[PDB]
Write a structure and sequence with these properties.
Pfam families: Cofilin_ADF (PF00241). It is found in: Cytoplasm; Cytoplasm, Cytoskeleton; Nucleus matrix. This protein has 4 helices and 5 strands. It has 133 residues and is α+β, with helices and mostly antiparallel strands. The protein has a single domain, classed as Severin. The chain has a 5-stranded mixed sheet with strand order 2-1-3-4-5, with helices on both faces. The longest helix is centred in the N-terminal third of the chain and has 12 residues. The radius of gyration is 14 Å and the shape is globular.
Length: 133
Amino acid sequence: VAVADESLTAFNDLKLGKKYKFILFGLNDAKTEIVVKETSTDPSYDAFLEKLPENDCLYAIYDFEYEINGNEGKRSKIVFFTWSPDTAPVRSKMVYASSKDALRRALNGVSTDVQGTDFSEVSYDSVLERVSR
């Protein structure tokens, strides 16, 4: 496997440039590379779980943005989601499981990781709670 030279370029953009609000990667039609399947600059979070393939897997790097009180202001944390519902093809889940670290390691700056195996274990309060404590 491998990662599209354009895949990380999109990450380096959303990070230092805050270009996109998040990215949706995934194995190419040939299953040998990780190309950015989708990107968006939409703030709302209830729009992210709306682009999640209910019956499919994929990698996503969100730029979580929440509020704090200790240092009055907003804080951001890059999250690494890992979609893999109970509906996704078993043959398409084992390929997204192994070639997972392929992306993970390639990206430096990722704060938290979240495995997606249920729409409830990827919700706001779920990702936010694990983004602080």
